[PDB]
Design a protein around this ligand. Structure first.
Ligand SMILES: CC(=O)N[C@@H]1[C@@H](O)[C@H](O)[C@@H](CO)O[C@@H]1CP(=O)(O)OP(=O)(O)OC/C=C(/C)CC/C=C(/C)CC/C=C(/C)CCC=C(C)C
Ligand SMILES: [Mn+2]
Ligand SMILES: [Mn+2]
Ligand code: NA
Lengths: 707, 8
């Protein structure tokens, strides 16, 4: 059984068996988390585990609304979005509950990545090494991270499609396959339909395919024709125009031998580049660079049409930077396998020139080093192929140096190598005991909100929570995962971190002006607010919001709820940072002192996660070797009852220490954050009953209503 | 790590 030769085998039957085994491996591998999570009630809702990224609830809301057949005007529902649409088709065709489909789609579709990897390896007569590469590439750390069970997001096909395009380019270079003329464009369309941001990669790949053609195939018409077709597929033409051109020119080339003259096809390239140009061409690319590579604040380019806002880029986890070791493990689950993968990729390049067309994806992945961990994904399968090639190279070496190795022993060696190098990825899965976006309890609080509020009502929350809130509660939000620039975030930041009088003025005004902006398209909503109430600057207007005698000339068109969950506590200073910024200025206003930490236990002088020693006295802290006096120790025994004990310490001091008995947690904050709407209305349950009605009072979250 | 959520 093991004595036979697998390396030389590239048959369709063997390749199908390998694809099936690798695909079952990919699925099986992301089934471990489901087995783990299933024993915890905290992760369920509606008899099924819950989704596992914040962004999944956007497409989940969209799917739900497609199934119901409508949404509200200007809830920003992803109705008609690609992933919502595929979810709706599968839901109508299959017998599983909505939550199960939405849970398992990534587990199915992300595993398709196994197909192009080993078909590409097969085009080079290396199918078995392709199998190894597909094993590594399907579960490699960062790829797994964004495609595990419950990662109900657009990432699940975001490498599958470009890899299929690559395969298509390879078949054209090796067999001059005429079906590329059809599939190359079609795939680009599918890619653009599934993930519009793909524009940039497509533009790069097509672009390189052009330069490649000017070099290695400067005379083969099929390359120029497919380039023109692909440029059309990149454009904003309606789909019927695109498909008409693609199928038309395809038949004309496939069944005509007098074919298309070269002048005509250069004309087609010119018409094409003109069309893509009208379609905005290259502008989306420079915009994406502006946000990710150059990290500019004003990315929409509105100098004095907007105010100046804190930059969200340095605030998003996905976009956070990463050190070389973590970069390498993100791509290959290990430093060693990464080095060998890179060597392998070089060797593959200087043996198969066509793999040059893989350089954009590779480049995108490396761009993570400047642009954030998010991007390593794009280098995972290319590099996996590199690793495949390294192995082929190595054993090739071992024969070109006449090393006595049986077939059985070469095969045992291969199986052992693949297992040992795939180990770090499996270990990563085992340890990546990721949890749900929210807890069942929060989903229950938000679903009861659904039965209490109206579809046309708003809840002011932080943008992190916009998609789940709209999913579980079916209401409107001010900000969410895709509406979260500084200019967007400012209002929720203000509502949550200022005092209650101006926070409630801002909740009414911000919800009303957002709703108006659907009909009026303000480039800056705050700027419409300012230049409406006859104020001179942003600061002038905002300071006038502090007035208990504030006139409100905008009539009330809906209820406005405010959502205050316990889990916001640890990101409160970051939330606060947005409204801490003078819009006239861009300038920071106050310093914001905050942190939350857990005791390690107790003897005698408590230590906490963050190295902050709490005095035995409960009268001073010791941060970084410096002892700082406390103004007060607030001992909170009931977040819902608002039962707490305010111990005065030093009227001359300025920092507060809070103990959360119901969580065994400590908070260290300043006067400005202590008086914020969140800390008062959530932690201490002190709210102006003339301004808000308490709708939900729970230790894990509070919901208030304006009036 | 890979969340369109807030950190800090
Ligand atoms: C649920 C949700 O929020 N979706 C939104 C989506 O609807 C919205 O349109 C979008 C923008 O707001 O954001 C939500 C979804 P998203 O975050 O996944 O999209 P995104 O922010 O655009 O992600 C950007 C990622 C990309 C992969 C795009 C390209 C990034 C670049 C830095 C440009 C690279 C330039 C090239 C020439 C490519 C080759 C690389 C070289 C040469 C180095
Ligand atoms: Mn996302
Ligand atoms: Mn709705
Ligand atoms: Na439990």
């Amino acid at each position: 059984e093991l004595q036979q030769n697998f390396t030389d085998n590239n048959s369709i039957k063997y390749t199908a068996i390998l694809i099936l085994i690798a695909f079952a491996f990919s699925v099986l591998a992301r089934l471990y988390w489901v087995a783990w999570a299933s024993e915890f009630y905290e992760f369920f809702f509606n008899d099924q585990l819950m989704i596992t990224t914040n962004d999944g609830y956007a497409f989940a809301e969209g799917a739900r609304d497609m199934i119901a057949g409508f949404h509200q005007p200007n809830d920003l529902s992803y109705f008609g979005s690609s992933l919502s649409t595929l979810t709706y088709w599968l839901y109508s065709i299959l017998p599983f509950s909505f939550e199960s489909i939405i849970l398992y789609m990534s587990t199915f579709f992300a595993s398709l990545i196994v197909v192009p990897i080993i078909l590409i390896a097969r085009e080079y007569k290396l199918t078995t090494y392709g199998f190894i590469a597909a094993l590594l590439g399907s579960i490699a750390n960062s790829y797994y991270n964004r495609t595990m069970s419950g990662y109900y997001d657009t990432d699940m096909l975001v490498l599958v499609l470009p890899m299929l395009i690559l395969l298509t380019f390879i078949r054209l270079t090796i067999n001059k396959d005429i079906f590329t003329l059809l599939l190359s464009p079609v795939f680009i369309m599918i890619y653009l339909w599934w993930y519009p941001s793909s524009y940039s990669l497509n533009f790069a790949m097509i672009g390189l395919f052009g330069l490649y053609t000017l070099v290695f195939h400067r005379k083969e018409k099929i390359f120029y024709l497919t380039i023109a077709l692909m440029i059309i597929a990149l454009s904003m033409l309606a789909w019927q125009y695109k498909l008409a051109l693609i199928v038309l020119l395809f038949a004309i080339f496939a069944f005509k031998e007098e074919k298309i003259n070269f002048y005509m096809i250069w004309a087609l390239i010119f018409i094409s580049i003109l069309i893509l140009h009208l379609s905005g061409g290259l502008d989306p690319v420079l915009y994406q660079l502006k946000f990710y590579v150059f990290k500019a604040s004003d990315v929409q380019n509105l100098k004095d049409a907007a105010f100046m806002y804190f930059n969200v880029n340095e605030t998003i986890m996905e976009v956070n930077t990463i050190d070389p070791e973590v970069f390498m493990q993100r791509i290959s689950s290990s430093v060693l396998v990464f080095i060998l993968s890179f060597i392998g990729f070089i060797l593959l390049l200087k043996d198969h020139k066509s793999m040059l067309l893989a350089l954009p994806m590779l480049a995108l992945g490396f761009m993570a080093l400047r642009a954030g961990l998010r991007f390593t994904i794009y280098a995972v399968p290319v590099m996996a192929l590199g690793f495949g090639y390294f192995l082929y190279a190595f054993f090739n070496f071992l024969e070109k140096k006449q090393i006595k190795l049986s077939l059985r022993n070469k095969n045992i060696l291969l199986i052992l190598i693949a297992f040992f190098s795939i180990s770090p990825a499996l270990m990563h899965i085992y340890y990546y005991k990721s949890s749900t976006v929210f807890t069942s309890y929060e989903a229950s609080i938000l679903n009861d909100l659904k039965n209490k509020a109206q579809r046309e009502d708003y809840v002011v929350a932080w943008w992190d929570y916009g998609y789940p809130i709209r999913y579980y509660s079916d209401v409107k939000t001010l900000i969410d995962g895709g509406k979260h620039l500084g200019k967007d975030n400012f209002f929720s930041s203000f509502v949550l971190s200022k005092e209650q009088i101006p926070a409630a003025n801002m909740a009414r005004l911000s919800v009303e002006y957002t709703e108006k902006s659907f009909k009026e398209n303000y480039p800056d909503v705050l700027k419409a607010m300012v230049k409406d109430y006859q104020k001179t600057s942003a600061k002038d207007f905002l300071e006038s919001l502090n007035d208990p005698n504030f006139k409100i000339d905008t009539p009330k068109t809906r209820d406005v709820y405010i959502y205050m969950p316990y889990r916001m506590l640890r990101i409160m200073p970051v939330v606060a940072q947005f409204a801490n910024t003078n819009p006239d200025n861009g300038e920071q206003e106050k310093s914001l002192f905050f942190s939350q930490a857990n005791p390690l236990d107790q003897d005698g002088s408590i230590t906490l996660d963050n190295g902050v020693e709490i005095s035995n006295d409960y009268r001073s802290l010791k941060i970084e070797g410096n002892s700082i006096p406390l103004k007060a120790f607030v001992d909170i025994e009931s977040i819902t009852n608002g039962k707490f004990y305010y111990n005065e310490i030093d009227s001359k001091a300025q920092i507060y220490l809070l103990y959360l008995r119901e969580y065994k947690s400590y908070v260290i904050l300043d006067e400005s954050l202590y008086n914020s709407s969140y800390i008062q209305m959530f932690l201490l349950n002190q709210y102006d009953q003339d301004l808000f009605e308490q709708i939900t009072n729970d230790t894990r979250a509070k919901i208030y209503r304006l009036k | 790590g890979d969340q369109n959520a807030t950190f800090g």
